[PDB]
Design a protein around this ligand. Structure first.
Ligand SMILES: [Mg+2]
Ligand SMILES: [Mg+2]
Lengths: 489, 489, 489, 489
């Protein structure tokens, strides 16, 4: 068996927007992402799937059944997000705070108790109360709660993504506006102030790199505001760094609990030995730039004392690798591997690819954990790992294999504190809609019933034993190819 | 949930030759099938895989671990075979019995206590004692035991399959010789006499239709003696009928426990409505001919009182269908469906096909059960159902779907007394060797360790609850195609 | 054999931007499309392939070899475009013409001889002379020349597609600006004035529906300006209608030769009988709206005498169908058929799909020809038909099948005057770059050599005989599926 | 261009049994192969396809149209077989000849003019006259004729393959009987005596290695007599050696024209460098054993002066390779490459596989030619090369690639005198029936019409130019994989 420490957390991660709606009274129309996915032009263009989150899995109403399943599965932790748009559907700009802003730089944001009280008057009571209800229930199952403050949607008053898509950059511009940093610090303080008694650890945000990158660079991904603008991507990146740091400080003014961040990772593997330098450049550009900012205060060639040391732990999201080839002194991502595979194809390495076209590459998770650990020596939590797999064909192997790799990291001295699968149940996969099914539990979107995939039973074994048991260790292997789609050669 | 009666049996089936060998001291070289699969010409021709049973899963030595797994899985029954070749490695012809033989017809075989004693003197003691040991252990787990007397291999003294393949029909000729019927009655009496205290129900034989059909007609299948001879197929068929009837009588002279037979079934589905008559002709030729003989005494246009009423229950093996098309007043099996599909392909009905090229067709199991029930109203046991599936891609769906169909039969009044999956663990699939993996448990043929596939955990749910639970009912569905091999169009 | 009239034209079609560059001295950087495909953000986003037209097949320098091949193949016609950007790299706004503009409506544009002379002073001499050279050579081979004035790229002075993508709608805005209509009339007059002696028939433009639709609606296609704006799509559509009408008039003021238009067509086939109305709505929206404007003067619910009767012939481009399903009183295009198939997949109708994911549907060409003929009774020329097929797997069948369908139309009384394959040679497929290979001749982009695919030899048979000969008629069939990619199910 | 010498022959090869029947009056029921493929047990077993040669392409009646096509294609040679069964449907044993037989060894057979006259009295006049008619017509087209005496079927009076399959080895036993050697010498003399004026070169037999190997070893292939017997395979091999030598002598007693043999070849390629010795052992066993016998007189460890020097030229049949791995001091053929690939799959080398599962491996043809040339320095004729390819997907590439390799051999000094494609038209592929389509011309088996595949037009280019022309040289490449079936991984 491959045994984990007794305190090691096995759980799941979940987003508000992806999972909450679907039950009566749950609809939240007041986010950029909601507007974005309902936009007729986006739908007609195929930027978004045409599926809508209000037809989703209904965690808002059915949370007890989600928690029931998690408890039955032996899960001891959940990282779940709250939605800013629900809590502050109306603007909070007029709540005065003490913020030192020097042009593009937000150096501090102090949120007084008076401001918190004014925010409380402005907050949506049903929303914040409901979060307390859901998270209290969660805790009542013996599930440790990691609260993630931001998981992409912004209140519409902060971002009109259609206006921005259209190039009206005077419209509310989301992470292109330093105001959003300040409002986020306010929001983060407020949520900690309200909910801290339920929270074990905080994350400020989930995968900010996807926000800036898909929002402004990889615009075929259909993410808001889908405004192809490299400068904008950088501006959003910087504002997300600043938002993280200012939220860290605001939350720490309320609570001394650990405050971290959750980030989208790939293992950047060189196509050949000659591409090792290129792979390192990719890692820097795509990973260390953000972390060196919030850990070391290094951003854009200068060091900011107001950014340094603003991280207590690192949430590693990991799905697959990116294979990197040198291109001059730059680099390029090699198609056919990693995230760039044929959906339900096979990479040139012989690794099957998920329903999303993501390559089976568990070894990457060890590498990413090791690299983060060696660089910063901050505690690591695997905050996402999973697979789009409607058939549960690859998932059992995917699950055990990746858990094994976490064990390897642990054995080698990485302080990894848990593994959170993405996700307990199927949910709304953003621009892809509902057809990308990442759950251990299948969701019937008509009935809202949860259904256990066999991988859920495998995860129960792992979670209840805190081990890859002898019975299931064989799943630490690559899915046999013959029965799977071969894709195209 | 889909709930079964409290007495309903969930278990597994297993063959001696397929599962026993692999541990030291287990090798039994003294069967036709052993000679057959080691024959160099057969191997070179690709008639057999080149894999050998002595490299198998090792139930002979490791039975306790098989039983441990079954018990952990909640299984309440096992149908397991004994091997004639192990018990009587040397000829028993000289043991006198009272047999009325009129040419080709063996009308009676009475085995006296004196004969049983003489047989006991000739029997291999280690073999019979070891079977008692294994089956006693099996019973000690709360597992009901259905003993199946014959599961294809014959002692070599009864059948030199290489000589017969070569056309030397004066060599020991297996089921071409009425002597084999008589020796089988002796063997069956002997085994019942020795082991009855361990046995709940007896089966005389497993899939005799495969024996005669693959042995003498479908010779590319690589089954012994692989002597292409339609008359021989019929002769073997008749001798297997007679063997069944004479074993039934011999066993009943010792014990009043139920004595049945286990048979290979397909649902014969008409390609179009116009093929309904053709499908009925196929059912008669391939199924009712045997059963009308052993139930109604009807064979070859005449009725034999010595055949009538020689069946207490029917073991339904079922894997897939055969699609039938009229061809004149005859019929033909339509390729691309049923058993004749591309391995890991998809049929024209959109049904995925197993690693063996067998179509996903759970509805067939209901039909076969209903048809047997309507015709004979004898108790039915699903004695095999499973899938060759190295990845466990289709099996979870296959399992639940077929169990559901058994429930449907039950609900409609069919007396089906249990469901036995083929098989608990991977084993030697005859001419196909080890690459056809039917286990709920994967076998590592190097280490002999058993490994739980996720389907094993699903079956545990079913067996422990005697139900398709709400959590797993969704698996009563066709595996999603996109992620599976599409085959060729 | 399937024989065509002696005057029936067999030839090819070709675009300037797609085929001209690749030889020294050919580079034309002065178009929107050139800027667009070199734009770093577009490349990084995957909107465009990263391939560049200057690395193309080199018709500008190597035209004689293209013509040699066409002549060897027996081709009697070519429709080839000229590039506005080459001819007028600098703005022509200051050339005064008499234009009646009432807001959005350009009712007339008269281009005086004085204006033509002023244009001639402003024109790029090398460009216009070179076109004369190439087209004179073309004619010297016995090849009839259909000159197409516009095939998507605009001079950059008329359209800064990056500025528009960014939402700076005050930048030169291409078909969003009525000025472009007027400049196009000037350009069209100028080209006719210069080149008419070489021209048999004129087309004003190629597939304007792709320009407006991909430019402003189907923005994932990576066409300029990629500004998602439904109103803009309509504005561009109207301006392309007006441009067509004003070019028709301007060309007719110079020459009485036939002036037509070339349009992207699909056969809109109803998924079920219940979708017939929906299919008709699709045809109207996607086809009749434009043609009723330029034939009947009907646009936007009003009739314009300045639009009526502005068409002498219709160039039918046809590649595949679109399957249409009713959606309320609207309609939707059914994925998996037509243009929306898996690249190298197979549709649900069993029709193989090209390297572009376009379904094999030759019957559509008959339908489209018949429908146009029944509606307008204007002469039809199949101005494009071909397939992206790097292996020449489907093309031989595609070619003969579609030619057969043209014959069927002819036999039924449609005045179809010829068939022009897209294309003689591989070329730059817009945002897809060079990997979509439509040639009868394969191009080696390194050496610029032309290579005959077997389909070229089949087309030679057709063209030289003006018939589908007895030897090749069997190719009027669907490519056998077994050997082709099956795609995913 | 890749140019061949002016005398180099481009043509086709054809078998009597595979191509003759299908027209009224052509049916020849009097061969082992005819009986074999009509045998009900064989059909039911799937040993043979159920297709029958009498439904074939009808060369017997339609030869002029075959020749017309060949002439239109520019072909200058044909190797065509005659059928012993047609010429001597009744036994010729009673025609006395002078034969020195020492047990198994037939050391000489002298056929006197008197014997020839007696044979002529016994011959079927319609058959021999008809062959003269067909071959005279062939010659009238400028086509050089290579007559091949034997191409597998034997007269039934020499071989009752069903009796032998059944193990009745006292029945007429074909190549298991030295009598067949003697009768073959008689037959060969007779045919040369009758037809020599039409013949340029003789071949005694086609692929005798397939006869002995598939007949008695690879019995799943469904070749007669399908009697699994390694000793028999060796006996048949020796008798085919002897038959070749005695036919050589008998033909040389009549004519001094070149007498050769046609043999089934593979390039035996080592899987790794460590398998080079194993590959050499495979070549010896499968190729040099026969040729060292008929060239060097070396057979079974002894040298026979009556075998030495009995070969004037070597007919190389080549389709694909066999990949060989050492297995101890033996060797094994590696599945998934060469002849052992998935039909319409792709090998691990990335080479597409034909409809027969044969890997695209043109380099093998050079190797085989070079090896034969280096060993014996006898003139070589590529007597077969082609592909089962119903779609003509791979064939154009297959054709040009293999022709290129013949050129390479020539350039390197191999005396290769021509290239004969298998085949001009589709025909009956033995146990596989009609679905394996090897023609440059597709045959419609209903109408008997011949249809030109595009590869036929490519071959016309080659044959008329005696070159791989510049236009088609690109086809010397591997078919692009993306559009083809990927098979299974
Ligand atoms: Mg699975
Ligand atoms: Mg082709």
């Amino acid at each position: 068996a491959v045994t984990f420490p007794k305190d090691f957390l096995f759980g799941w991660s979940q987003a508000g927007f992806q999972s909450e709606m679907g039950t009566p009274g749950s609809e939240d129309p007041n986010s950029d992402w909601y507007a974005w996915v309902h936009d007729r032009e986006n739908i007609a263009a195929g930027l978004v799937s045409g599926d809508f989150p209000e037809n989703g899995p209904g965690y808002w109403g059915n949370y007890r059944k989600f928690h029931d399943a998690a408890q039955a599965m032996g899960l001891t932790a959940a990282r779940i997000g709250v939605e800013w748009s629900r809590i502050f559907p109306r603007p909070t700009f007029d709540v005065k705070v003490d913020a030192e802003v020097k042009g593009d730089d937000v150096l501090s944001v102090y949120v007084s108790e008076g401001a918190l009280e004014q925010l409380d008057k402005m907050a949506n009571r049903d929303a914040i109360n409901h979060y307390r209800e859901m998270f209290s229930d969660l805790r009542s199952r013996g599930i440790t709660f990691i609260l993630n403050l931001y998981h992409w949607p912004l209140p519409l008053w902060l971002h009109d993504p259609i206006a921005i898509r259209r190039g009206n950059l005077s419209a509310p511009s989301g992470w292109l506006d330093v105001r959003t940093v300040i409002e986020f610090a306010k929001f983060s303080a407020y949520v900690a102030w309200k909910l801290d008694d339920l929270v074990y650890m905080y994350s400020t945000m989930n995968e900010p790199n996807v926000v800036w990158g898909l929002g402004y660079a990889a615009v075929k991904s259909g993410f808001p505001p889908g405004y192809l603008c490299l400068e904008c991507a950088g501006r959003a990146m910087k504002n997300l760094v600043q938002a993280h740091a200012r939220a860290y400080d605001a939350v720490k003014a309320i609570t001394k609990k650990p405050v971290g961040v959750i980030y989208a990772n790939s293992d950047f593997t060189p196509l050949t030995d000659a591409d090792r330098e290129a792979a390192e450049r990719a890692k820097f550009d795509n990973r260390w730039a953000f972390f060196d900012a919030v850990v070391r205060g290094q951003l854009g060639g200068s060091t900011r004392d107001d950014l340094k040391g603003r991280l207590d732990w690192i949430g590693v999201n990991y799905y697959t690798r990116q294979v990197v080839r040198a291109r001059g002194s730059g680099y390029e991502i090699v198609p056919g591997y990693g995230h760039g595979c044929e959906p339900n194809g096979v990479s040139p390495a012989g690794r099957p690819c998920s329903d999303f076209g993501w390559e089976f590459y568990p070894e990457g998770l060890y590498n990413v954990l090791k690299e983060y650990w060696d660089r910063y020596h901050l505690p690591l939590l695997v905050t996402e790992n999973g697979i789009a797999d409607e058939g549960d064909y690859q998932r059992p192997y995917y699950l055990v294999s990746h858990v094994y790799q976490v064990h390897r990291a642990l054995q080698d001295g990485v302080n990894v504190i848990g593994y959170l699968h993405w996700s307990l149940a199927d949910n709304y996969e953003w621009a892809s809609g509902f057809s990308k099914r990442f759950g251990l539990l299948m969701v019937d979107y008509s009935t809202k019933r949860l259904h256990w995939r066999p991988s859920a039973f495998i995860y129960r074994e792992i979670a209840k034993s805190r081990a890859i048991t002898d019975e299931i260790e064989h799943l630490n292997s690559v899915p046999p190819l013959r029965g799977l789609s071969p894709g195209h050669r």
